[PDB]
Amino acid sequence: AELTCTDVSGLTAEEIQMRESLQYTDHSPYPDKTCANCQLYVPAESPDQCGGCQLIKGPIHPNGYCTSWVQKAT
Numbered sequence: 001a002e003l004t005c006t007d008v009s010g011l012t013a014e015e016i017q018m019r020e021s022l023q024y025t026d027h028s029p030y031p032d033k034t035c036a037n038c039q040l041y042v043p044a045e046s047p048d049q050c051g052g053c054q055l056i057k058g059p060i061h062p063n064g065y066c067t068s069w070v071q072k073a074t
């Protein structure tokens with residue numbers, strides 16, 4: 001199975017609510033906007049693990065997205 005980053009069981013209800021507010025998804029709807037090209041992403045320690053985010057808590061997929069995506073590209 002591919003890497004999934006939707007296990008929110010270590011988060012508080014309020015932290016989950018923020019993630020939902022921002023429409024976090026593992027599968028970005030946009031070809032050109034993913035967590036991996038967002039300024040707030042923190043890459044994983046292995047490509048076989050989820051990364052993280054400075055803005056929302058919990059596991060974060062590099063192919064994912066939320067509506068607060070902050071462009072890296074100059």
Ligand code: SF4
Binds near residue numbers: 042056067070
């Ligand atoms: S701010 Fe949103 S798009 Fe950027 S890394 Fe975090 S979850 Fe992904």
